[PDB]
Amino acid sequence: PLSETKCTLKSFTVEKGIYQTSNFRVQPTESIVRFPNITNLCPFHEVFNATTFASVYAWNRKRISNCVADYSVIYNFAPFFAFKCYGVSPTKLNDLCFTNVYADSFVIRGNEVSQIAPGQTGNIADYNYKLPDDFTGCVIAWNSNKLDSKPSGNYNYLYRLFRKSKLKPFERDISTEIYQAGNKPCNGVAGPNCYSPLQSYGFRPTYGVGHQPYRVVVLSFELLHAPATVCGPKKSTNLVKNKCVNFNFNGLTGTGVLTESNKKFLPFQQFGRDIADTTDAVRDPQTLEILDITPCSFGGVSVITPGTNTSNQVAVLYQGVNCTWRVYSTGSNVFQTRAGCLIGAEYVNNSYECDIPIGAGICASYQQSIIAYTMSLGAENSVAYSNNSIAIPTNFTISVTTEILPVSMTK
Amino acid sequence: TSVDCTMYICGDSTECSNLLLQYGSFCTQLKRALTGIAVEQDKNTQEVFAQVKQIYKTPPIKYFGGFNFSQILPDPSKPSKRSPIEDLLFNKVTICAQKFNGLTVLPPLLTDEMIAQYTSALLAGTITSGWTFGAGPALQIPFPMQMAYRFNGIGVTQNVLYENQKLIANQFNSAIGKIQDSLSSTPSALGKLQDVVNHNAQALNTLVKQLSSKFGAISSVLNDILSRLDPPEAEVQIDRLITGRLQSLQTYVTQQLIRAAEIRASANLAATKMSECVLGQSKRVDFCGKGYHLMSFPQSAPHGVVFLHVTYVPAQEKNF
Amino acid sequence: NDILSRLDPPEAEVQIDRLITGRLQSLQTYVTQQLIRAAEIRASANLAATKMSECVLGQSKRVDFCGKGYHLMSFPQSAPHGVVFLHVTYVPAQEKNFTTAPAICHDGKAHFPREGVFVSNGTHWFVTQRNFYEPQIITTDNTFVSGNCDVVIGIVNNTVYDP
Amino acid sequence: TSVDCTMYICGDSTECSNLLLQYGSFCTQLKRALTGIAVEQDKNTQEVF
Structure with a gap:
């Protein structure tokens, strides 16, 4: 630590006094992941591979209940074209559990695939469809020219481009949708301005690249919610006691040591957020056991030394850390001042005048050895007191003393 | 107090320290400031306290002309070596989660015991030796010998004390008896030290609650962002949270350097009054209390000092 | 210089925008620290000017304000960005413990010191001042009379001399 | 002197005050200090008087 002091103070000589360095910061031993034992096969093939799906005007917005799925079911389709995703990068949609996945499937053209991106306007992003622009979910598209396309032409599929008023994100609009525009009442039967909001597509397999049928599934969800709905398989492991450890409890993680229950809770109340708005108490995903999280203790390392011109025997102190404990290896002597742990120095019952302060009336000095001692207030003195005695001085001295006062610093 | 710049800004994440080091030259100044x-x-x-390098002790027998000082001298039968006035000042004046975010507090070099010993030695010097102990060696003087000279310092002939010392003793004993119930009657008199304590406390609390802030980021948590996004993107979310926290540090330590300034001035003024109202009999009016000042008693307090000024005011007058 | 040689100026303000801000906050921190240190050294200069006015131009009889103990006189001296004071003060060295009394009985009346402390070697009685031991003979012009020998405690029967 | 938190930083628009609340606990100590x-x-x- 003398060399660390030289490193910190960017000089080769240090004269005296207390200094600062980094902390202990003990490392976690292992990591604990806990999952509930309810692990089934979650059906995703019914939205991926099936018969000819509906057009974009009809949404099969599917609520996927509590299940267990991974990306292996999704991975079955090589012709994935629009692999672009938002919110979570596509390499890590595994081993994290959502709360409400929103799956909606439709069939669109090749050039309409790029229109599903948020914050833009297009054939789909017009009155036909409005979507939330934050879009924590993703879009997955794959070509289906060998199944959806028909030799006779797929003219049955429609889309409601020409609806009058605006759409809001995540709304359902399927009705007759009569068109009443112009400076005349159309009544749906006039003839001048009886425009049709629904138009056909046309699918024959001799086209360009931008007119091919594409299956698109869109997912919309959010995070930071206590229940978990669906995520990949992970072998749960047992917890540990009184050990610095990482933990992952179905989503949110942390690092610290664990303690048994001391409080009552409430039988749907499982989180333990404190006045500091930090998680410190939680219950097991598999059992009804309250456990308390307290993070592993920090250090705070300081160094004490005499003059480099004098000697090189140094000592270090750890603020707040009890030793009596988790300080790796020891040295010649360990002391347990209320300021903190101290090693590299000895202790005496004597009292001498302090040269460098440490804390709580403790000071370390140099004898060939570094000695830590309690505060010496000065020479102990008492004066006799009597009802009829006066001390009167006869000889005296004059003394000169110095005082140094700053006046101004450099302009 | 002391802060760790790495632990407050970042958790156990190497990349946050990597984006801290490209700033690099900020929290070293924070370290030197703290x-x-x-x-x-x-x-x-x-x-303020160690103005004398000669610790004293009280005589066991107190023939103080009928005076009583048992309220201010420390009681040996008390488990602590403090006066009952010190006990009232202690119990009339009133964390781990705050510590556990890299927010450390340092214990003072001086604890209560030896500063109580300093106050007891100061009382021993000012009772049995007068005020000459602030110059050289302590010269022992009887207390009614000293009070006559203190009257002479305020233009009073010493015959007044030797005529009315019984009434002086009764008045001073009654006043010391009154001052205990005066201090214990209301806690509004102790508001000059609760303000510093709770001002430090709420400043630390508004510092530590600043972590849960949506500083242009998807989440205020650092770990879930790492599990959320790729390392090229979301640096634009990390760095804004870095800036919003370091500006909070800047506003905190600027306010701390502000608040230390008047605390230093008040400590200097208290040391000046330690010099004047205790070690001497200053004739500066209103500087040592109210009216013509006789003498003062110092007593320690949590992070503070309190002075009992005994002064002099006339009661009955006539026209001539 | 290199970043203007590196980037098309439409994306310069995309790139060279924030280091200007960072230098601005760094210099703001420097300015704030300069104000703090300037206020501290301004208070120090006020204290130095006050002690220059007190300790030098007069015999300031405040204790510890102009040195240690009873202050006599002072020497000001310059220093690079500073001032240094040489205080010449008084301090007693040797002392003796003597027997006292607040007043003197003589002919049934009480004698009080006009100025000084009553002391005795054991056989005779004398008076001094509060800092030196010079025994003076108790004479009616060295003291004064107010009252008699009942209200005052510690009084001793003795003699006084009339010139 | 005193300065209002919200109306100085943002005019008579709701969404500027909505975007203001992310920092949230910043102008409270400013008002307390003023x-x-x-x-x-x-x-x-x-x-003095």
């Missing part, structure tokens, strides 16, 4: 305010603050107490 | 400076500044006349 060490500077620490060495400035703990050095205040010696010139 | 009331402080006001209260000891009004206090300063008592011990």
Whole structure:
């Protein structure tokens, strides 16, 4: 630590006094992941591979209940074209559990695939469809020219481009949708301005690249919610006691040591957020056991030394850390001042005048050895007191003393 | 107090420290500022208290002309070596989760025991030796011998004391008896030290609650962002949270350097009054209390000092 | 210089925008620290000017304000960005413990010191001042009379001399 | 002097105040400090007058 002091103070000589360095910061031993034992096969093939799906005007917005799925079911389709995703990068949609996945499937053209991106306007992003622009979910598209396309032409599929008023994100609009525009009442039967909001597509397999049928599934969800709905398989492991450890409890993680229950809770109340708005108490995903999280203790390392011109025997102190404990290896002597742990120095019952302060009336000095001692207030003195005695001085001295006062610093 | 710049800004994440080091040259100044305010603050107490390098003790027998001082001298039968006035000042004046975010507090170099010993030695010097002990060796003087000279310092002939010392003793004993119930009657008189304590406390609390802030980020948590996004993107979310936290540090330590300034001035003024109202009989009017000043008693307090000024006011007058 | 040689100026303000801000906050921190240190050294200069006015231009009889103990006189001296004071003060060295009394009985009346402390070697009685031991003979012009020998405690029967 | 938190930073628009609340706990200590400076500044006349 003398060399660390030289490193910190960017000089080769240090004269005296207390200094600062980094902390202990003990490392976690292992990591604990806990999952509930309810692990089934979650059906995703019914939205991926099936018969000819509906057009974009009809949404099969599917609520996927509590299940267990991974990306292996999704991975079955090589012709994935629009692999672009938002919110979570596509390499890590595994081993994290959502709360409400929103799956909606439709069939669109090749050039309409790029229109599903948020914050833009297009054939789909017009009155036909409005979507939330934050879009924590993703879009997955794959070509289906060998199944959806028909030799006779797929003219049955429609889309409601020409609806009058605006759409809001995540709304359902399927009705007759009569068109009443112009400076005349159309009544749906006039003839001048009886425009049709629904138009056909046309699918024959001799086209360009931008007119091919594409299956698109869109997912919309959010995070930071206590229940978990669906995520990949992970072998749960047992917890540990009184050990610095990482933990992952179905989503949110942390690092610290664990303690048994001391409080009552409430039988749907499982989180333990404190006045500091930090998680410190939680219950097991598999059992009804309250456990308390307290993070592993920090250090705070300081160094004490005499003059480099004098000697090189140094000592270090750890603020707040009890030793009596988790300080790796020891040295010649360990002391347990209320300021903190101290090693590299000895202790005496004597009292001498302090040269460098440490804390709580403790000071370390140099004898060939570094000695830590309690505060010496000065020479102990008492004066006799009597009802009829006066001390009167006869000889005296004059003394000169110095005082140094700053006046101004450099302009 | 002391802060760790790495632990407050970032958790156990290497990449956050990597984006901290490209700033690099900020929290070293934070370190030097907190060490500077620490060495400035703990050095205040010696010139307030250790003005004498000769610790004294009280005589066992008190023939103090009928005076009583049992309320201010420390009681040996008390488990602590403090006066009952010190006990009232202690119990009339009133964390781990705050510590556990890299927010450390440092214990003072001086604890209560030896500053109580300093106050007891100061009382021993000012009772049995008068005020000459602030110059050289302590010269023992009887107390009614000293009060006559203190009257002579305020233009009073010493015959007045030797005529009315019984009434002086009764008045002073009654006043000391009154001052205990005066201090214990209301806690509004102790508001001059609760303000510093709770001002430090709420400043630390508004510092530590600043972590849960949506500083242009998807989430205020650092770990879930790492599990959320790729390392090229979301650096634009990390760095804004870095800036919003370091500006909070800047506003905190600027306010701390502001608040240390008047604390140093008040400590200097208290040391000046330690010099004047205790070690001498200053004729500066209203500087040592109200009216013509006789003498003062110092008593320690949590992070503070309190002075009992005994002064002099006339009661009955006539026209001539 | 290199970043203007590196980037098309439409994306310069995309790139060279924030280091200007960072230098601005760094210099703001420097300015704030300069104000703090300037206020501290301004208070120090006020204290130095006050002690220059007190300790030098007069015999300031405040204790510890102009040195240690009873202050006599002072020497000001310059220093690079500073001032240094040489205080010449008084301090007693040797002392003796003597027997006292607040008043003197003589002919049934009480004698009080006009100025000084009553002391005795054991056989005779004398008076001094509060800092030196010079025994003076108790004479009616060295003291004064107010009252008699009942209200005052510690009084001793003795003699006084009339010139 | 005193300064209002919301109306100075943002005009008569709701969404600027919505975008204001992300920092949230920043102008509270500013208002507390201005009331402080006001209260000891009004206090300063008592011990001198």
